């Protein structure tokens, strides 16, 4: 269940009261991320694995 990744993400960007922000927006957040490319670096490695 991805409610996982989003959490960490925002956190690593201090300022935000993670716990103090709903599950909503979060999902919509995924919805947008899913449509994004990967940085060659990142990507190029997964293909390898």
């Amino acid at each position: 269940k991805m409610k996982a990744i989003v959490e960490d993400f925002l956190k690593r960007l201090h300022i935000f009261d993670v716990a103090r922000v709903p599950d909503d927006q979060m999902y919509r957040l995924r919805d947008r991320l899913r449509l994004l490319p990967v940085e060659v670096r990142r990507l190029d490695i997964f293909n390898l694995i």
């Binding site: 716990a19 103090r20 709903p22 599950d23 909503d24």
Partner: protein
């Protein structure tokens, strides 16, 4: 050796659903509580706060 007793489930037979309001209300009520007793409780919610 198996043997059971027929449940006998002939329908309505009596049409109370067209005059005996007083009693329907008492039925509905009943059938209703019955229902709540079953409707599974929910889980994993979003922290109220």
């Amino acid at each position: 050796t198996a043997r059971y007793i027929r449940p006998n489930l002939l329908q309505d037979r009596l049409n109370l659903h067209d005059n005996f309001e007083s009693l329907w209300d008492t039925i509905t009520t009943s059938n209703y509580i019955l229902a709540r007793s079953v409707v599974p409780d929910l889980k994993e919610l979003v922290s109220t706060e």
